[PDB]
Ligand binder design. Structure first.
Ligand SMILES: *[C@@H]1O[C@H](CO[C@H]2O[C@@H](C)[C@@H](O)[C@@H](O)[C@@H]2O)[C@@H](O[C@@H]2O[C@H](CO)[C@@H](O[C@@H]3O[C@H](CO)[C@@H](O)[C@H](O)[C@@H]3O)[C@H](O)[C@H]2NC(C)=O)[C@H](O)[C@H]1NC(C)=O
Ligand SMILES: *[C@@H]1O[C@H](CO[C@H]2O[C@@H](C)[C@@H](O)[C@@H](O)[C@@H]2O)[C@@H](O[C@@H]2O[C@H](CO)[C@@H](O[C@@H]3O[C@H](CO)[C@@H](O)[C@H](O)[C@@H]3O)[C@H](O)[C@H]2NC(C)=O)[C@H](O)[C@H]1NC(C)=O
Lengths: 218, 96
């Protein structure tokens, strides 16, 4: 997240870190005790058995007893197209069920088909780069953004910070976009580099996939 | 064991996952080309034809000294040349 602020510790207990070799590479969202939701491009051709699903984290540079760690048992997808990053969403079944507590909770999703208009105020978050050509954050970051439709495909939810250069950046893929308490987006891609102040950030539109998500997580 | 972050932009679109190449002990540029082209195909479905029909298709090494080397994915005259992988800071792969 470029141009954001540190989140309060465990402010967003559904926030997940996906790690390979002890390094964060993508975010995810806890949507059931044994399921997380992320971007399909995060796991499309990786060593899945090595992925660690880290719940209850806040500061990736500290040892944290609040954490619960799981493995990926199964990958569910729905028409992912890597050429154009369409339907960039995956549901990952865990090898166990999280214990719900103060630091680990499931997110709430919108109703199928619900579309957000221009100007809706949302919050983006993640452990991605703090600047361009940067390194991963230590502390979870958050960022006030606004939904926009200009330069956005109907198959995406797009957001912008008006008046300054701020936005999601590498390592933020897979992280939730929260809008009035509900997860409406999964961070997917940027155009013109991170925090261009020109192109909006693009998220996979969670509300278009809710019936499918529900059929998997019950 | 040196790790080098890289990004891929195709038709302006850049996926946001944090990705590294893992390699002191020099390698041929060809070894880097193979990995770059394979990940272009693996991550964004970019084919040999897409590369050949793009206006531009390159990857740029940003070195730790601050210099930048542009490698053409169409033509790599430096394929058989060598480079110290530990001198590389990041790689920007760009097809459009
Ligand atoms: C769901 O998966 C997690 C993730 O662990 C993965 O790690 C690989 C290597 C594989 O062996 C398998 O365990 C998982 O795919 C499991 O968490 C791990 O569980 C094991 C054993 O329960 C732990 O091993 C222990 O580690 C310490 C040293 O760190 C040893 O001294 C112990 O003797 C013991 O071997 C390991 O610490 C756990 N890893 C993490 C990151 O927590 C989890 O058990 C599993 N859950 C279910 C229900 O299957
Ligand atoms: C930057 O974002 C935060 C949080 O945004 C998230 O939370 C909600 C409110 C919404 O924006 C949503 O899309 C995201 O889920 C904003 O913090 C919130 O600000 C309001 C007041 O401005 C807080 O007060 C609450 O709202 C009503 C009126 O709206 C008040 O009467 C009550 O006092 C009530 O407490 C609200 O608690 C905050 N929400 C959280 C989670 O902290 C923040 O305002 C925004 N910054 C700017 C400049 O817009």
């Amino acid at each position: 997240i470029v141009g954001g602020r540190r989140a309060r510790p465990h402010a967003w207990p559904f926030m997940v870190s996906l790690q390979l070799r002890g390094g964060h590479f993508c975010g995810a969202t806890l949507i059931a005790p044994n399921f997380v939701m992320s971007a399909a491009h995060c796991v499309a051709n990786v060593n899945v058995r090595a992925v660690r699903v880290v719940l209850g984290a806040h500061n990736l540079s500290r040892r944290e007893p609040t954490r619960q760690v799981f493995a990926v048992q199964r990958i569910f997808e729905n028409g992912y197209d890597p050429v154009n990053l369409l339907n960039d969403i995956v549901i990952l079944q865990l090898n166990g069920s999280a214990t719900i507590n103060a630091n680990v909770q499931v997110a709430q999703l919108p109703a199928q088909g619900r579309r957000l208009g221009n100007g809706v105020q949302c919050l983006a978050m993640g452990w991605g780069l703090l600047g361009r050509n940067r390194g991963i954050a230590s502390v979870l970051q958050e960022l006030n953004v606004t939904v926009v439709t200009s330069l956005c495909r109907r198959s995406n939810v797009c957001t912008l910070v008006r008046g300054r250069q701020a936005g999601v950046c590498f390592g933020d893929s897979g992280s939730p976009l929260v809008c009035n308490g509900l997860i409406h987006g999964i961070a997917s891609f940027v155009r013109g580099g991170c925090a261009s102040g020109l192109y909006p950030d693009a998220f996979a539109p969670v509300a278009q996939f809710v019936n499918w998500i529900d059929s998997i997580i019950q | 064991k040196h790790t080098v972050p890289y990004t891929i932009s195709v038709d302006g679109i850049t996926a946001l996952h944090r990705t590294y190449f893992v390699f002191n002990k020099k390698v041929l540029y060809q070894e880097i080309d193979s990995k770059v082209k394979n990940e272009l195909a693996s991550q964004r479905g970019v084919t040999t034809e897409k590369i050949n029909n793009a206006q531009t298709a390159t990857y740029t090494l940003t070195l730790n000294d601050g210099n930048k080397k542009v490698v053409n994915l169409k033509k790599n005259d430096d394929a058989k040349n060598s480079i110290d992988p530990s001198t590389i800071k990041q790689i920007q792969i760009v097809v459009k």
